[PDB]
Design a protein. Sequence first.
Lengths: 286, 102, 76, 76, 76, 51, 563, 287
Amino acid sequence: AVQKVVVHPLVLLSVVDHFNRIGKVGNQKRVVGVLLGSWQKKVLDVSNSFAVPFDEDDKDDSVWFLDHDYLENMYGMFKKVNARERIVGWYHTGPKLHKNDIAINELMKRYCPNSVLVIIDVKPKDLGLPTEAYISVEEVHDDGTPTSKTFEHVTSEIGAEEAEEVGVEHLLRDIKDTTVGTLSQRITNQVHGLKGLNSKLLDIRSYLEKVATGKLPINHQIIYQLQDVFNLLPDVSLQEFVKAFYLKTNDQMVVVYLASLIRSVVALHNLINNKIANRDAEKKEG
Amino acid sequence: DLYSRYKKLQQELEFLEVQEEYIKDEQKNLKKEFLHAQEEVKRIQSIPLVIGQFLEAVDQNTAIVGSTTGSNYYVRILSTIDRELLKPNASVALHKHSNALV
Amino acid sequence: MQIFVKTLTGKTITLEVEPSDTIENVKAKIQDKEGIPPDQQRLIFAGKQLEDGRTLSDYNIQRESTLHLVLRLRGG
Amino acid sequence: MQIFVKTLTGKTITLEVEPSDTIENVKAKIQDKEGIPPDQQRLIFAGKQLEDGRTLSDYNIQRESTLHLVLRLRGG
Amino acid sequence: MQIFVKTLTGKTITLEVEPSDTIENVKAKIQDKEGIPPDQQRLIFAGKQLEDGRTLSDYNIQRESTLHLVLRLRGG
Amino acid sequence: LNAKVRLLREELQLLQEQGSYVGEVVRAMDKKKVLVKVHPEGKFVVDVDKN
Amino acid sequence: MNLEKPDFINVCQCLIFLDDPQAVSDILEKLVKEDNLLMAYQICFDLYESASQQFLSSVIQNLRTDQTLKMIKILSGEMAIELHLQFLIRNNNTDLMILKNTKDAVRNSVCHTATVIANSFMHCGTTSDQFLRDNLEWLARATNWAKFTATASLGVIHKGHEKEALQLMATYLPKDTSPGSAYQEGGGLYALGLIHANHGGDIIDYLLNQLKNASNDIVRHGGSLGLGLAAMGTARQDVYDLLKTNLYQDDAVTGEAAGLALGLVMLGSKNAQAIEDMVGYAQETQHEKILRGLAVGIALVMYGRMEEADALIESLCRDKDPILRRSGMYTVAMAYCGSGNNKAIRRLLHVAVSDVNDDVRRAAVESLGFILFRTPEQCPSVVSLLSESYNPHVRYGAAMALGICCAGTGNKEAINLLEPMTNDPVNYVRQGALIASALIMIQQTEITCPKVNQFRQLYSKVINDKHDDVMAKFGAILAQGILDAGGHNVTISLQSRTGHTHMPSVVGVLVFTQFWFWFPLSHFLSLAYTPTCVIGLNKDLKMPKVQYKSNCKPSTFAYPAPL
Amino acid sequence: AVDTAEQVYISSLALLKMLKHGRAGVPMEVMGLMLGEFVDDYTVRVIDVFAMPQSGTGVSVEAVDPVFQAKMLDMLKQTGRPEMVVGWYHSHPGFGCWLSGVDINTQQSFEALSERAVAVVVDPIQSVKGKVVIDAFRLINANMMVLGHEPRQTTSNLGHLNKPSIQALIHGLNRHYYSITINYRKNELEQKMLLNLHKKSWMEGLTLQDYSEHCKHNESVVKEMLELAKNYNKAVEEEDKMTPEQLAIKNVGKQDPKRHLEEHVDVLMTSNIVQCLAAMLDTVVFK
């Protein structure tokens, strides 16, 4: 099992390189490759990757063709250069999971029992993080329906190390932002947050509306119980909570009345000195 | 007569307005540059550096210090340290690479 | 669909092709009648750099267009 | 309402649209008019970059308003 | 007997030899044609590093054989 | 404001510099040469600059 | 016209501001009918010296479709060329001592070529070769691309010496003397280009043939600059085809040559096809040189079109590739030339203060000059504060914007600002300030402005020092040649005699400032020197002797520097 | 023909690779190959880098066996990167960046085999905080220097920044080799996978931490500002009829108003305004 994955920039950049270059061999929608990495304790650190030739068909999910021998050879050479990394998993691009993917997983799970799948979305989007990480497990599924194999999400984060961040910071020198910000960076964040929240809430419709149309079957087992919980969890303004009004005012009597004042007295002092000096320097020449 | 004065007044008014907007913008960017520069200067001693011991002060922002590895050196000093703490001897910090006093 | 290829030598050569073809096929036809190895062929269209992996329709190429062939001289 | 858009080469294009139209719908309309892929286009009003997640009513793009369009001259 | 020597830069170099020739003679030919000291050349055929004590009649080489050359790169 | 930031930038530029040794002179020499004795060890013949 | 008499003022100004060639041709014919020939001659000379090209074409065509010869010849310019050359060839009196000194002081670096440029400036239009003739074992020290510059320089000595042109150039036997160089052939066509500027005449149909056959490396570079120079502004389609085909060949050294020349012929035509084809080839290419060509070649396609260009601007200004953004700034410069429009200033200042890439900051702030020169008293008030920003590029741009705004007149405040900057620590900004001062003080004597004998000495300090940076003395040795142009008899201005913006001068001085990126472009300054004289005449064929009389002069002004 | 002031374009990815590998084997030197294209008569573009088996030591390196190199090109070629090699690079652990006398003997073989192949040198432990010490060189032949001919050709973009270091100038600079200008052409797409990426958040934009952790902060800052203010009062009561030049005369430190009084105000204002605004948003976005 794993509680989180940590991804280094180098893999992200190499994936972009792969996706740009592949046009040299034959048009394809997506690309596939191995991830190398290491285990500390229930946290997984990824640090390198390499291409592997792959081909697909756009309709039939029974047809595809990975390649064993290229994989084994290249891993041999990489191991001959360095020995501390080992096979850890694989990645593909494309924005949405393909039905086919489990069938690939049960292949290369043979090279590492805990094969984890990372999706990297190469083309941009506004709302947030670029990558997702998934792990494969069977389930009880129900009171009683066939057990199967599907993925579940695992939380994901982007990492860094010494002498990889220095190159990044050099590349990014031309475009920079305030480290902390003074009401010009905190205020923007709130707007960004509201964008994300509204995105999620709108995405709920596209499912729940079409299930109400009956276009697809009800996943009664899970979704509705969670969305009963949700509608339960908001709060309310109930005469007792509003009695914790007595906190807004105690912010203001530290802001307004004891920080503005000593910001005006300084300005008067500077003005007095300025007028004194300027008039003195006038009459001195007269 | 008065027509020319009227027109020229209009023109110079609007043109000094343009200059005013320019100056506001340049103020806004120079502030950011100054902030960034202080940010760079802050990380010049947050380093695993070495201990020397103060030996002599020649003039402003310059001194002579003998490091604990022998090899007596002669180096600038940082612009933010207080001066009246380093007369006879002291435990001073020396940059690992440049031997700049911090 | 005929297409005209121009070399740096001043020669113009006309190849009949169909819009379904792909750049490597054209380079193979060149290797046919030019005899220059396909790896030693580089093709520019209107300043763009063509890829061996794609179809003609990806570059909107129409009838009788001119393509420029350039050699690689790193072997000096 | 009828509105006009101008482009690099100066061609002026006429679109008839309704206030609730979203920016992706406008993109679809203009690609229907001229076949440009909807990603190869960006549109500008006043000084600010229009973004897709909103209706024309949100920016209150008035009747007969003029828009600027920016594009690569060809998709490649 | 004509043979082809490739290199990592894409340079290709034909050469004429006879199967009685010993390998160091080949490295001498490379030296005189290119201008490279015999120490610095290392030779590969079919994935085996060749050795001076042997003729090209050994290693059963045939004409039009593709050898590879690699440099003795060092630093310090 | 511009003067202030320019000054700070110049100071940071200067701090990126290499150190120097200190040496005892035992005697001068002719045609711009001195004989010095660097602290750890050594007995060198060094050249003077233009100033 | 209802007033008692016909006149110049209305027909000079209004008919070319309105662009009504039919009306001027009609009133000209009417003035011929009643046999008032002196008016009909003065109007022709007045017109040619300030009417645009192609305007003359429509006028002459409508006219001709006897007095015909003596009016057509004065209308196309031939005797104006003759007379101007005849003035310069007689009033020449340059002082060779300065060349002898700088020649003796030079060390064998780049400064060598910097000499043979400036020399050609001072002997411009003078047809005298002496400095390149009395010594030759020194000039033969040049090799490689330098041979291209030096041999091109003859083209600026013989400027306007059109009549014999071709026989002269082959007289150097550049091709026969040895096939062992292509750089000479490359220079020859450039020289023919410089001699026949604007007057494409016959030579277009010769260059257009000679460009057909090429050792494509260098010969095509010379050829395309020459042909793009001879035919500028005519929009001739048969030329444009051949330059497009050379551009599409996609070769670095032949890149910006055609990139310019394809821009010169279309100048101001607003041609909606050329812009889309050129911008489409600037995107999705991968050689910087071609972009550094098209950076200029685009902007010249729009000229004075003002608001009718805006649409392209705020397209081109959005592009990510920085050379395109710079070319956007050049376009907003040319669009509004001379016209003090406010919002263009607002844009240029915002860009200069904000953008992340230095070269667009230079090319932004530098272009302020081209839209303010109608009121040179105003430029110092804005650029002054720029001159102290922390990053050098903005300082260089400021200095050059002063040099280009006040160019013709020794406005005191400009010198007052440039004085401290001539000692800036960063070498290339000294290189800037020297040339700016030299432009702004051409033909000024001590009584007319005080500072001259400071500067006239300062150069000879720098050029004789040896503890300095090469580029600084490059700028100095150029300033010497700028200050004594054409035997003291020529001056630089953008305004015409009567308020029109003289297009060849704007083009020449714009494309001069690219000397930063490619040295042989510096000769393009020669288009800006206008002669400064009064010609006494009583009949077109007849210069009768007269003496004018200049009152209120102690006679200590005028011709300077005999000493 | 002769060279001029040209250039080297290196991709961002290859830079990360060089830094990472150089820092890995830190007590010893490391070296590798680099792959790219001579796109025109005077720029050179390097796209990718890979290491090779090597017998490192604290002052030198040698490559072990050739078969590895010959193979890996043939592997890469069938997944879409056919470019041949353009040059090589190595690292100097603690010294300056310059060429040793053995590097010349290595380099001459590449130059004899291909006309333009640059050589690259990296320093992994001076590149510590916010700069990179990386450089590229080529040889100058001996006999040409004796003849009047100089190394190159001139156009005005030679002289920016490219002041040589004295440390490098002690060795064969100019005399034996010359530096080449370097710049990083970060094209589109890979721009965004860095700028909009290494730092980000979503729900973090709406978090409160309203317990004591806030009130205690306020009651530290105001408490110390009490003494700052008393100090400033005393420090201005002097009111002596002297001249502010004399004030500058004795001015050394702790200039109360500017030095300290104001930053406390700015900090307190920032914190409290942001907190109150966030509470006011959450009071409406959720029920």
